[PDB]
Amino acid sequence: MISYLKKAEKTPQTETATAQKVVTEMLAEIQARGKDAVRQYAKQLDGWSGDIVLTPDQIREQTKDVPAGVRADIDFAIRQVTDFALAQRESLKEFSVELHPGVTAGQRVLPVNVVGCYAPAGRYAHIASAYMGVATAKAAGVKTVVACSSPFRGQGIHPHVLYAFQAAGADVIMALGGVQAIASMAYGLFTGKPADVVVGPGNKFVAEAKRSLYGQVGIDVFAGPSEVAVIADETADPAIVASDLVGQAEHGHESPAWLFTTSRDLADRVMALVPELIAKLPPTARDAATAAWRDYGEVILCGTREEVVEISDRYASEHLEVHTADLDWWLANLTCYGSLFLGEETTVAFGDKTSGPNHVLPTKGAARYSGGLSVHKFMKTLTWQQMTREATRQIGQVTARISRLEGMEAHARTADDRMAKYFPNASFEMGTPVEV
Amino acid sequence: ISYLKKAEKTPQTETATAQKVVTEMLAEIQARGKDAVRQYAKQLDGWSGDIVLTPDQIREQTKDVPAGVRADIDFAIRQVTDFALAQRESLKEFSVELHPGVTAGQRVLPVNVVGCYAPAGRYAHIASAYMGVATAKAAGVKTVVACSSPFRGQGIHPHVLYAFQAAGADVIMALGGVQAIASMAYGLFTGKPADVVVGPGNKFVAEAKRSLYGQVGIDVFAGPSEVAVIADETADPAIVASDLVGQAEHGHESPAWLFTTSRDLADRVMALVPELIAKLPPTARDAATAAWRDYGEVILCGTREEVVEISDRYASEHLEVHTADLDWWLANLTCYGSLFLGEETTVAFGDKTSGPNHVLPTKGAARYSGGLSVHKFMKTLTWQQMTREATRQIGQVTARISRLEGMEAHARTADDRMAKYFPNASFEMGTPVEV
Ligand SMILES: NC(=O)C1=CN([C@@H]2O[C@H](COP(=O)(O)OP(=O)(O)OC[C@H]3O[C@@H](n4cnc5c(N)ncnc54)[C@H](O)[C@@H]3O)[C@@H](O)[C@H]2O)C=CC1
Ligand SMILES: NC(=O)C1=CN([C@@H]2O[C@H](COP(=O)(O)OP(=O)(O)OC[C@H]3O[C@@H](n4cnc5c(N)ncnc54)[C@H](O)[C@@H]3O)[C@@H](O)[C@H]2O)C=CC1
Ligand SMILES: N[C@@H](CS(=O)(=O)O)C(=O)O
Ligand SMILES: N[C@@H](CS(=O)(=O)O)C(=O)O
Ligand SMILES: [Zn+2]
Ligand SMILES: [Zn+2]
């Protein structure tokens, strides 16, 4: 038996209907009206009536005052993300194999042509998100990267976001936010370069827009309001656990922070500390985190490690920290999470900004079926095959027979035609011809 | 570049029709659950019986499937499995050191539950039944649920059923169409919602899967079958024409495309295709006549490079190459579902028994994905671990960037570690955020 010491009124699912209604209306307008609707939304939602595509010269002008120390930090983080991305790239190989004798089959691994990357800017300016998308796309060998971020605080793109996009290798940069940005990248509005894949994190509207546009484009994953889970035993430090939960709760009113523990004492101290830490935050963060903890935060006490694994796997958190003994066991036994942080020393914020692994990660249970943005999301794994004539003796008769069982005579005739051309003297059973 | 035959319709033509039906049906199933599904099954497919088949039913319904049939299906399952296991070996786990003391790695883990759909309407898709289930089993998925439409006012086609059973399905349901995809996504009738739903189908099936993405993962948008052939002057028109017709019989919406550098070849094929269609039995003849007329296209190009450009833009589900210098085509083509190099292999071989999966992207989805494979059932997740020493650099960069973004609570998680691990250290952690 599992005890909820803190139960949330709301979950990542609560706001689904609200997001869907807005996105349905906006995507309909943009499909009908194109750039006209996008310019309208940019003005009405973001107060923006400037040009949307930045020229190379505006990019230089807008970043000319970014200090050396800020550039050095962003450059370091880009290098870490690139290093890990290149290691991930090496993990997926091309190959060919012989199947039935004379049947050669293989796998080609090819980057997509055009990627659109979104970096959010609303409550905060997402400098790290800006290099997470673009640097990964460049590591994957994508030749055209289009990047968008929302106009921020009465100006255009945040200068540090813009520096990140430029340093990471973006080919085209647009001052454009939200659903209208996602849609513009999917349809190639303003650039004439429709994306093959659109990636990047955002609020519930951004995430729903990407989900809805799937099919028009590929995507990385459903990457909506941030979530954090911590697994802790009696070895954990409640002050650090509480700090880590509050860390992601500041993202917004809808960010869940989950604690799964085998220690009642830990649970109690964390529940006492989280409100105290929230109260010491500055206004924007305090507003977000107070609501998020109240409405979405949960604390679950479990009897055994196996019970913790079961609940953790069901929650399928974007981020999972593990502050326990015997970390090898947790790495071996946990199966549903976006990104795993083993031990107290690393933490979600480190992964968010500069550890290396991508931060763009599944939310709302998408970790049941996908990991996060990676080079893998920009590669197509395509198959090819080639046969000797000899291989077609077996392959062809099996194809003709199965085809005819299914009722597909024209399929069987492509096998009959090869058998008659290559082996006119053979007499295999090719199945009773279909008559209806 | 010149169109010798231009289609009135494309894969895009019927999108609105599909989306309207799917939106209505999903809204109804979300409201009324199993009852909505049982009603759709009755009205659409004539079905009143039990939806979940019992083991006794499965055995009873397959008891007369002959040895010769079983041997062919078993052979095809082996080829699909062999290629799937090769694909599974191509994606590895690893760990690496980044900044000194930072370890990061990739875990590759199968999903828990897969739902597989095998179509049955115009034809009964025996091969489709093992393409999904066998691949899921090769990936190490523990629970596989399989559905196929009640066929012609009776139950699941017995050979589709045999295929599901022999390929390793854990649960089999007699359920078709949108109501099948929805039932597997939501775990109706089994209590086991799928993590990933896969499999091909008509425009309604494919749209239902596209719509339910998010609730579940999917393989790919896999709608009405498409075929493209690239041919030069060395190609045999009789075989090209045959191959086009072969997939045209799938239904009235199936495009058959010919890209060639030889006007002679194009002309002979355009004469032959109608003649071959005319010789088909009634159901196929009806499908292929409409498909070729409405969706068939023939494009003449001046250079190989032009062919590549056009082929890549069409991004066909299946692409056959009947040319000299096949190495060049393998090296230069980039958008297709599955490639058939040389005259000897052909799409129907891939459909039934070559090995590589036939469940493939249509309507331009080959621009961003390959087909169903074990890779669609594996999650690639990341993990990391650090020494305390590593956090001196990582932590100060985190704190500074966080504060530049306006994220003070993020920075405090770094400040807290620095104060705990290195209480005498003094770093630039960034100006605290005040708004
Ligand atoms: N899953 C992941 O990996 C990550 C998720 N995130 C999440 O990204 C989110 C960022 O959210 P925001 O600050 O809002 O930035 P955002 O860039 O996602 O959204 C700002 C844009 O949304 C539009 N918008 C806002 N409310 C709207 C409404 N009612 N109707 C239509 N458009 C509307 C704005 O006008 C603007 O164009 C946070 O929830 C954060 O946790 C952040 C990083 C990574
Ligand atoms: N992309 C790929 O890899 C593959 C594609 N396919 C395609 O699969 C398709 C199979 O189509 P079908 O024979 O129809 O079998 P299906 O199993 O896809 O469709 C039959 C189901 O659809 C329902 N349905 C039919 N019309 C409907 C309507 N108007 N409204 C609501 N429900 C409706 C039926 O009642 C039944 O439940 C073909 O187009 C074939 O080319 C087949 C194999 C692989
Ligand atoms: N924690 C965010 C990343 S960031 O803090 O916005 O950089 C996420 O959900 O990945
Ligand atoms: N040609 C079908 C496969 S099958 O002929 O239905 O077996 C496809 O589109 O993949
Ligand atoms: Zn964060
Ligand atoms: Zn076929």
A180 is in an annotated binding site: yes
In a domain, B238, yes or no: yes
Residue B165 structural domain: 15-220
Contacts 24+ apart (CB under 8 A), B287-290: B287/B122, B287/B248, B287/B249, B287/B250, B287/B251, B287/B252, B287/B254, B288/A410, B288/B245, B288/B248, B288/B249, B290/B252
Give me the residue label for tokens 């269609």.
Answer: B277
**In angstroms, what separates the C-alpha of B210 from chain A's closest C-alpha?**
7
| Amino acid at position B28, single letter | E
Q: Is A203 annotated as a binding residue?
A: yes
CA distance A320 to A307: 16
SS3 of A334, please? Answer: coil
Confirm or reject: Cβ of B125 under 6 Å from ligand 4. Answer: yes
Residue A209 shares a structural domain with residue A238: no
CB contact at 8 A, B266 and B300: yes
Contacts of A408 in chain B (CB under 8 A): 123, 249, 284, 348
Residue A23 lies in a domain: no
The answer to whether residues A296 and A8 touch, using CB atoms and an 8 Å cutoff, is: yes
With a 6 Å cutoff on the Cβ, whether B247 touches ligand 4 is: yes
Measured between beta carbons, which residues in chain B are less than 8 angstroms from residue A406?
123-127, 159
Residues in chain A within 8 Å Cβ distance of B210: 214-215
* Beta carbon of B202 within 6 Å of any ligand 2 atom: yes
Q: Which of B104, B337, B413 sits opposite A349 (nearest CB)?
A: B413
Q: Are A119 and A164 in contact (CB under 8 A)?
A: yes
Eight-class DSSP state of B193: -
| CA atoms within a 13 Å half-sphere pointing along the CA-CB vector of A427 | 0
Tokens representing residue B9 in the block: 């319709």
| Cβ-nearest to A125 among B280, B406, B417 | B406
Distances B378 to A319, A367, B49, B336, B372 between C-alpha atoms, Å: 18, 11, 35, 22, 12
Q: Which of B196, B220, B244 represents a domain boundary (last residue)?
A: B220
Residue whose Cα lies nearest atom 6 of ligand 3: it is A126
Asked whether the beta carbons of B342 and B322 are under 8 A apart, the reply is yes
Assess whether B243 and B209 both reside in one domain.
Answer: no
Token pair in block for residue B202: 């008509």
The residue assigned the tokens 């070996």 is B89
Picking from B188, B220, B252, the residue at the C-terminal end of a domain is B220
Last residue of a domain, one of A351, A381, A411: A381
Is residue B309 located within the same domain as residue B398? no
Could you tell me if residue A24 is inside a domain?
no
Q: Is residue B6 in some structural domain? A: no
Q: Are A354 and B398 an interchain contact pair (Cβ–Cβ within 8 Å)?
A: yes
Catalytic: which of B14, B249, B317, B320?
Answer: B317
Residue B242: its chain A contacts at CB < 8 A? 413-414, 417
Residue B318 catalytic? Answer: yes
CB within 8 Å of A29: residues ≥ 6 apart = A37, A40, A41
Q: How far is the CA of B254 from the centre of ligand 6 (A)?
A: 10
B322 and B185 co-located in one domain: no
The reply to whether A245 and A191 lie within a common domain is no
Residues in A closer than 8 angstroms to B214, CB to CB, are 211, 222, 364, 366
Answer whether B122 contacts ligand 2 (Cβ < 6 A): yes
Task: CATH number of the domain at A41, please.
Answer: 3.40.50.1980
Q: Is A126 a known active-site residue?
A: no
Structure tokens at A101: 């004798």
Q: How many helices (H) and strands (E) does chain B have?
A: 15, 14
Per the domain annotation, does A29 fall within a domain? no
A118 is in an annotated binding site: yes
CA dihedral for B371, B377, B378, B380, sign (positive or negative): positive
User: What single string gives the DSSP state of each residue in A243-296?
Assistant: HHHHHHHTT-TT--EEEEES-HHHHHHHHHHHHHHHHTS-HHHHHHHHHHHHHH
Helix (H) or strand (E) holding A305: helix A305-315
Q: Do the domain assignments include residue A308?
A: yes
Q: Is B288 on the interface with A (CB under 8 A)?
A: yes
B283 and B353 housed in the same domain: yes
Residue A21 lies in a domain: no
Distance A155 CA to ligand 1 centre (A): 17
Ligand 1 neighbour A188 (Cβ under 6 A): no
- Please check whether residues B57 and B99 belong to one and the same domain: yes
Structure tokens at A397: 């008769």
Structural domain count, chain A? 3
B381 falls within a domain = no
Same domain flag for A399 and A288: no
Q: For residue A268, what are the CA distances in angstroms to A205, A214, A255, A304?
A: 35, 43, 21, 18
Query: CB count, 10 Å around CB of B310?
Result: 16
Best probe residue, ligand 1, of A203, A206, A208, A374 (max atoms within 8 Å of C-beta) = A203
- Nearest Cα of chain A lies from the Cα of B177 at a distance, in angstroms, of 18
3-state secondary structure of B165: helix
A315 is in an annotated binding site: no
* Chain B contact probe: residue of A395, A397, A416 with most B CBs at under 10 A: A395
Q: Is B271 helix (H, G, I), strand (E, B) or coil?
A: helix
**∠ CA A302-A307-A313 to the nearest 5 degrees?**
115
If asked whether residues A58 and A117 sit together in one domain, one would say yes
Give the list of residues 6+ apart from residue A72 with CB closer than 8 angstroms, or none.
none
A226 in ligand 1 pocket by Cβ < 6 Å? yes
Identified catalytic residue from B157, B159, B318, B358: B318
Hey, which residues does B103 pair with through a beta bridge? Answer: B97, B385
CB distance B294 to B252 below 8 Å = yes
What is the C-alpha separation between B97 and B386, in angstroms, rounded? 10
Please indicate, yes or no, whether residues A214 and A354 belong to a single structural domain of this protein. no
In a shared domain, residues A400 and A272 = no
Catalytic residue among A158, A160, A253, A319: A319
Beta strands in B31-93 (DSSP E): none
Q: Which residue has the tokens 């199936």?
A: B254
- Which ligand 3 atom lies nearest to the CA of residue A129? 7
- Name the B residues in 144-163 with CB < 8 Å from any A CB: 159
Q: Please tell me whether residues B28 and B142 are part of one structural domain.
A: yes
| Cα of A56 to nearest chain B Cα, Å | 24
